[PDB]
Amino acid sequence: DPAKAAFNSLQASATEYIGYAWAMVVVIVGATIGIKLFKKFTSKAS
Amino acid sequence: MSVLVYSFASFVLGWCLRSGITYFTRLMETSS
Amino acid sequence: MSVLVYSFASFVLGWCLRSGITYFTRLMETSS
């Protein structure tokens, strides 16, 4: 099936894209939640 | 029906891969 | 597979270029 071959090629390409997204998502969320937790706990210490 | 089945499978694959990011980000955000 | 590979590369390029704006704006916004 030509569609089967296209989908199988897409599966391999998708793993590259989701690997890229994950490596960026981790670092970005580590920074935003850390500045959110920082501002929150400083104000709680008050 | 072959191109419909494989094109639909591509759409579901895309939703599944990205939804994993969306859920992780949302849960962690509301968790803090 | 050539048109699939280059069309997919175009999608990833577009995500990468715009995501740089999104991350910068979001970080600076929550920073203040």
Binding site: - | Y6, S7, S10, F11, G14, R18, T22 | -
Partner: peptide
């Protein structure tokens, strides 16, 4: 070039568009 050429190219374009629409749909919180 040939009908088969157009057919195969169109199918590959379709799956890569459906994946992109899938990412946009999945990224809606």
């Amino acid at each position: 070039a040939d009908f088969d050429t157009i057919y195969q190219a169109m199918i590959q374009i379709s799956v890569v568009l459906c994946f992109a629409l899938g990412i946009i749909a999945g990224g809606q919180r």
